[PDB]
Design a protein around this ligand. Structure first.
Ligand SMILES: CC(=O)N[C@H]1CNC[C@H](O)[C@@H](O)[C@@H]1O
Length: 339
């Protein structure tokens, strides 16, 4: 089988029949995991094994950014710094910050792969304007050039463990005031101002950028539709102007900002019509199931190529080997000392 366009979640720490029904649905492409899905490493590994036993082509992801966004923080998962801490380190020693960024990405990726997870929805490329509380310390730095090179260094670390990446929230959640979880944010700048600064890391990363999540933010001088529902942002700018060929994942359609798109099924249709390859529907698996069964038909072949490319590459070390690996051990020591 081949992956569908919907990324949803499972009900708990072990798979239920309802989960297995949803996982088997042709429109399912992925699972996103949250803190409630984690008791310990052994339980998590068994959960991801069982998910792949139902659907072998499934993508498994998690939000592991560090700082305030890190779902697994116990039983041996390394608590990672907020990305803002890396920008602060850069302001003292640029080269060391890049070295530390790579170590963070390697630890991050290697620990997740040891538990059977394909990817993390990282890095945040939002610029640290200071305007956005929802982003806040999740942003690397104010300067798009600095964001770019730190994110690139992080992504390199991810790649060393065979893990891809996902830049977010395109074209930038950093300038807008409001929190898209609970309201619909706006950004009234010109297209050109947005392109010159907030979009610049997406453009400069080139092949070091594997995927994008777009913001549920309305950029009122560019398009009346939030970015994740906007063909202007997703096709004209991202695919067109930037020539990006990686996967586009919608931000979570359960977020309040996304009700600007309609019922869940209507919003999903709109995100995919706009240019998302996958849509996230989090924290309401039965509503996700209505989406799975109601989605309007579309061409998906181009999307499927991109989705398959998000699967982790090559073999991962299990925990019992990772814990003795000098590279892993070295990275741990560097993170400890440098911050
Ligand atoms: C704007 C914002 O913080 N969105 C987050 C929440 N929605 C879906 C995922 O959990 C995560 O990757 C997103 O970054």
């Amino acid at each position: 089988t081949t992956p569908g366009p919907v990324m949803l979640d499972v009900v708990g720490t072990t798979l239920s029949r309802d989960d297995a029904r949803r996982l088997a649905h042709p429109n399912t492409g992925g699972v996103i995991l949250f803190a409630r899905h984690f008791q310990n490493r052994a339980q998590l590994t068994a959960l991801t094994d069982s998910i792949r036993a139902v659907r072998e082509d499934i993508l498994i992801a998690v939000d592991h950014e560090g700082g305030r966004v890190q779902r697994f923080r116990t039983d041996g998962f390394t608590v990672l710094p907020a990305m803002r801490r890396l920008g602060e380190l850069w302001d003292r020693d640029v080269l060391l910050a890049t070295k530390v960024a790579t170590a963070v990405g390697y630890i991050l990726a290697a620990e997740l792969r040891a538990c059977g997870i394909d990817m993390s929805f990282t890095p945040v490329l939002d610029l640290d304007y200071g305007h956005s509380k929802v982003i806040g310390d999740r942003a690397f730095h104010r300067d798009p050039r600095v964001v770019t090179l730190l994110a690139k260094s992080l992504n390199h670390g991810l790649s060393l463990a065979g893990m891809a990446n996902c830049g977010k929230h395109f074209p930038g959640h950093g300038f807008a005031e409001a929190d898209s979880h609970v309201a619909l944010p706006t950004d009234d700048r010109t297209l050109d101002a947005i392109l010159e600064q907030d979009v610049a890391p997406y453009d400069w990363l080139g092949l070091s950028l594997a995927a994008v999540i777009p913001a549920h933010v309305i950029y009122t001088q560019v398009d009346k539709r939030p970015a994740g529902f906007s063909r202007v942002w997703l096709q004209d700018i991202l695919r067109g102007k930037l020539g990006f060929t990686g996967a586009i994942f919608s931000d979570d359609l359960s977020m309040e900002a996304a009700r600007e798109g309609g019922t869940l099924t209507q919003a999903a249709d709109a995100a995919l019509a706009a240019g998302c390859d996958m849509v996230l529907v989090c924290n309401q698996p039965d509503a996700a199931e209505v989406v799975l069964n109601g989605l309007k038909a579309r061409a998906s072949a181009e999307s499927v190529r991109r989705i398959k490319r998000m699967r982790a590459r090559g073999k991962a070390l299990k925990w019992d080997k990772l814990i003795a690996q000098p590279e892993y051990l070295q990275a741990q020591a560097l993170l400890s000392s440098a911050l």
